Design a protein around this nucleic acid. Structure first.
Ligand SMILES: Nc1ncnc2c1ncn2[C@@H]1O[C@H](CSCC[C@H](N)C(=O)O)[C@@H](O)[C@H]1O
Lengths: 321, 239
RNA sequence: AAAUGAGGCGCUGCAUGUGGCAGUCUGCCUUUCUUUU
């Protein structure tokens, strides 16, 4: 019957969720065990799980599904469940028991791994990595087999398949060689290096430029207003059609508003001077943005990105001369 | 909307090849300065740089997210050197092993791949006064699959500046080779913007009229031929 | 002859509405920020 099949699925998933390996990996269900009287949790808490919502929301059928159950006991009402056997320590032989496997065909299922790997051993745990909550399998799996010889049989049975010990030593060797190459390149950069209150108030220096067209990048705008006369600031968030510039002098402002030809005829732009209390509130906005930038904590940049940046800039400058 | 794809990447060390470079003939490529446009993954670039020997070869693209990956592709052939085969997943998240080969100051060039370098920039400055300001520094210019997107994105006008700029970058005696797109499926993708469609209906030159316009003296190429999508050799004159 | 990578966390001290700079073992880590909870 399909009802019996659903009971078998519920018993299978719950006995995995009270399995030893999955409890020794997951933080959360262990905390649901530990924040309890003698290790208990409501069944409707387990109903909230994403694979459990794919099956059954009826807790009565779930309590019927754990009548034939090996490692779950229920208390009285069929609304709380125990682990039957209490949780001991985490074993260390599971590191030896594990199997790493690369090259998955982007159709990764836990059931797909059980369908290929139940034949040679009794599969206990699977780890599968998703690409940053975009729901994509990466292409490799961590399979937990039990008691060594099943896994050593399975590695002999074959989709590169290798041991976790081999994987960990391979990781150690890979990081050692990358550290050696980056040490030599840091020596190269050392050798070539050895070879070689904020802004104050001026009236009328602020030009607001409105556009009807959506504006391009601010580097082009900085080069556009800077090629005519002296820009102190180009204020533009990426995607706004209205922007500002702060200039050095009112002579700079008077020159750029008299640049009618190359500004207004090339592009439909309204280049004007803020006056009134628009200027006063804009100086307030400048001082507030200054205090916000100064109170900002520092950005993070990793070592290999900064080093690959500096290394490519020095390769560019040394190749071009 | 440039149509660029990160796929068809070459993990393979350059014996097994794409097949476009099977068509190309070896004679020009030996010890000659090469500018090459539009090569995002760099796999066709690097395979030229290994098998034949140019002195300097520079690829150029616009997308900053593609040139960073092409520099990863040059780092993979340096990370090429019980031997280990290396888990594929480990490299993906950690990045490749080796360093970028920055040369010395007392250094010897023309050794794979101390030659090649990927620079980033838009090619057309949109000003013919800036087209006139250029100087020649190359011998062999290669350009595949650029006519399509530059055509659809910059009209005829940016394409005319691109032809004039590549004639301004050739040294005399220098060779430009092209395999341009046919007119075939230009329409298939016009709605990436409205501006892309407004330039697709603004097309005032055909790909059969490409080879006429390159012989037109607004660009001014000397002699051209076709020895095999089409395969075309355009020559600036000798000296 | 048509769409995935710097993904996570820092520690410094010079500069800072100015678009960061020089270090930190490649700054460390990467199965992992992770829901088969
Ligand atoms: N104006 C321009 N300036 C610089 N590069 C441009 C450009 N217009 C287009 N390109 C580049 O030219 C490339 C052509 S797509 C061809 C890529 C190549 N066949 C490969 O396999 O990688 C585009 O990806 C785009 O990045």
């Amino acid at each position: 019957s399909r009802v019996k099949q659903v009971l078998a699925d519920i018993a299978k998933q719950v006995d995995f969720w009270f399995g030893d390996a999955n409890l020794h990996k997951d933080r959360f269900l262990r905390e649901q065990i530990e924040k309890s009287r003698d290790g208990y949790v409501d069944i409707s808490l387990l109903v909230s799980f994403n694979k459990m919502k794919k099956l059954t929301t009826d807790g009565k059928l779930i309590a019927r599904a754990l009548r034939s159950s090996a490692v779950v006991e229920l208390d009285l009402e069929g609304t709380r469940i125990r682990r039957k056997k209490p949780l001991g320590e985490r074993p260390k032989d599971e590191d030896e028991r594990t199997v790493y496997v690369e090259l998955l065909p982007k159709n990764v299922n836990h059931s797909w791994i059980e369908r290929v790997f139940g034949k040679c051993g009794n599969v206990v745990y699977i780890s599968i990595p998703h690409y940053k909550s975009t729901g994509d399998p990466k292409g490799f799996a961590f399979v937990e087999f039990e008691t060594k010889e099943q896994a050593a049989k399975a590695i002999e049975f074959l989709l590169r398949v290798l041991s976790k010990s081999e994987w960990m030593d391979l990781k150690k060797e890979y990081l050692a060689l990358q550290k050696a190459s980056m040490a030599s390149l840091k020596k190269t950069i050392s050798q070539i290096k050895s070879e070689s209150t904020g802004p104050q108030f001026v009236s009328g220096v602020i030009v607001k430029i409105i556009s009807t067209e959506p504006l391009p990048g601010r580097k082009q705008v900085r080069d556009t207003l800077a090629a005519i006369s002296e820009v102190l600031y180009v204020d533009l968030l990426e995607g706004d059609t209205e922007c500002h510039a702060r200039f050095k002098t009112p002579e700079d402002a008077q020159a750029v508003i008299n640049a009618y030809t190359e500004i207004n005829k090339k592009h439909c732009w309204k280049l004007e001077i803020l006056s009134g209390d628009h200027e006063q509130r804009y100086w307030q906005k400048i001082l507030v943005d200054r205090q916000a930038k100064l109170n900002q904590p520092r950005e993070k940049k990793r070592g290999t990105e900064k080093l690959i940046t500096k290394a490519e800039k020095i390769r560019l400058a040394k190749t071009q001369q | 909307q440039y149509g660029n794809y990160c796929k068809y990447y070459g993990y393979r060390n350059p014996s097994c090849e794409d097949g476009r470079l099977r068509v190309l003939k070896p004679e020009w490529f030996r010890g000659r300065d090469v500018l090459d446009l539009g090569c995002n993954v760099g796999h066709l670039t690097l395979s030229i740089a290994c098998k034949w020997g140019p002195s300097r070869m520079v690829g150029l693209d616009i997308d900053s997210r593609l040139i960073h990956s092409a520099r990863q592709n040059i780092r993979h052939y340096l990370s090429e050197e019980k031997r280990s085969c290396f888990p594929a997943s480990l490299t993906a998240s950690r990045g490749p092993i080796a360093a970028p080969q920055v040369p010395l100051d007392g250094a010897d060039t023309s050794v794979f791949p101390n030659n090649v370098v990927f620079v980033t920039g838009n090619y057309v400055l949109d000003r013919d006064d800036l087209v006139e300001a250029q100087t020649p520094e190359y011998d062999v210019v290669l350009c595949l699959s650029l006519t399509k997107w530059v055509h659809l994105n910059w009209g005829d006008e940016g394409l005319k500046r691109m032809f004039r700029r590549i004639y301004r970058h050739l040294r005399p005696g220098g060779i430009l080779v092209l395999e341009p797109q046919p007119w075939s499926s230009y329409g298939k993708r016009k709605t990436l913007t409205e501006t892309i469609y407004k330039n697709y209906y603004r097309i005032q030159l055909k790909p059969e009229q490409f080879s006429s316009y390159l012989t037109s003296p607004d660009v001014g190429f000397s002699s051209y031929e076709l020895v095999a999508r089409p395969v075309y050799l355009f020559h600036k004159a000798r000296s």
